[PDB]
């Protein structure tokens, strides 16, 4: 329509934000950023509909403007900034550090963690290229573009970063038999321990993946997210660890935790 969009209704906003179909017929549009539109969590929906630390966007703007908040080691004083996958946020108040990861129910969880677990993150390499003047570089899944990494670091690998700079703490390559995390599809939030893969040269590299209950499935190689090696995750993981039990098994779980 004659130019960029600026508005966003509810019911075009994604499902997993869990925004309610009442309460005004307009929704918070994620302004552009280092993450996409849909696999992103605005800070407004975060603060206003995950913690209830505020009730209204006016209050949230007060918060963002008084700068209790900071992402990537930076204040990021916008009410609708994309808090994407894996991302880190640090709050002086309560001295908390929340991390933005997924749950198996297909939602952005709220992973309470410490300042060092915030001070490092994870990032999937999106691609690698050679910039001008012969500077090899790569770019991640969070718009971060980084220069002079190891040549051993290639595509589909994952990096662990300092968060005071965009430099590397370490890296993990992609190969058969490594612990991963899923981003896309019915498997949103699974953790399923790569068992093998398949090429289909021409499009849609596919991967057969199963979690420790033997339970297997198949996913797209650009929807997966490698988090390190089998056993140790490089971070702390949320309730469930990407399992997707049955409706009845979860019913029994909660009925035990009545």
């Amino acid at each position: 329509a004659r130019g960029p969009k600026k508005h966003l209704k509810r019911l075009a906003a994604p499902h997993h934000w869990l925004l309610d179909k009442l309460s005004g017929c307009y929704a918070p549009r994620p302004s552009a950023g280092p993450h996409k539109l849909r696999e992103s969590l605005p800070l407004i929906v975060f603060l206003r509909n995950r913690l209830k630390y505020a009730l209204n966007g006016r209050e949230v703007k007060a918060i963002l403007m008084q700068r209790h908040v900071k992402v990537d080691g930076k204040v990021r004083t916008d009410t609708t900034y994309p808090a994407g996958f894996m991302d880190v946020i640090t709050l002086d108040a309560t001295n908390e550090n929340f991390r933005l990861v997924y749950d198996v129910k297909g939602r952005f969880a709220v992973h309470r963690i410490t300042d060092e677990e915030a001070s490092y993150k994870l990032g999937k390499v999106k691609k690698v290229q050679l910039g001008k003047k012969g500077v090899p570089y790569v770019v991640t899944h969070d718009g971060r573009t980084i220069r002079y990494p190891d040549p051993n670091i290639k595509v589909n690998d994952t990096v662990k970063i300092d968060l005071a700079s965009g430099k590397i703490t370490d890296f993990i390559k992609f190969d058969a038999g490594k612990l991963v995390y899923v981003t896309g599809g019915r498997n949103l939030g699974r953790i399923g321990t790569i068992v093998h893969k398949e090429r289909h040269d021409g499009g849609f590299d596919l991967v057969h993946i199963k979690d420790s209950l033997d339970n297997t499935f198949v996913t797209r190689l650009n929807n997966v997210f490698v988090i390190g090696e089998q056993g140790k995750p490089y971070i702390s993981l949320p309730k469930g660890k990407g399992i997707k039990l049955s409706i009845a098994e979860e019913r029994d779980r909660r009925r035990a935790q009545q």
């Binding site: 209704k9 509810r10 019911l11 179909k21 009442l22 005004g24 017929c25």
Partner: protein
């Protein structure tokens, strides 16, 4: 623009209206349980029919 509030009834009229047997039976029920409305009676029968359809198409399964 405001997404419209869903509405859906909780009753269903008789297929065939004037059956003296049906009318006298439901009148007995109304006059014993203290009711005013065949609307209420149809409503309860409709709930029962829904759950009964579920029962049928569930016990159909292994």
């Amino acid at each position: 623009p405001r997404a419209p509030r869903t509405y859906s009834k909780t009753y269903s009229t008789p297929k065939r209206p004037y059956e003296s047997s049906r009318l006298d039976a439901e009148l007995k029920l109304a006059g014993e349980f203290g009711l005013k409305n065949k609307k209420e009676i149809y409503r309860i029968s409709f709930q029962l029919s829904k759950i009964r359809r579920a029962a049928r198409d569930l016990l159909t399964r292994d």
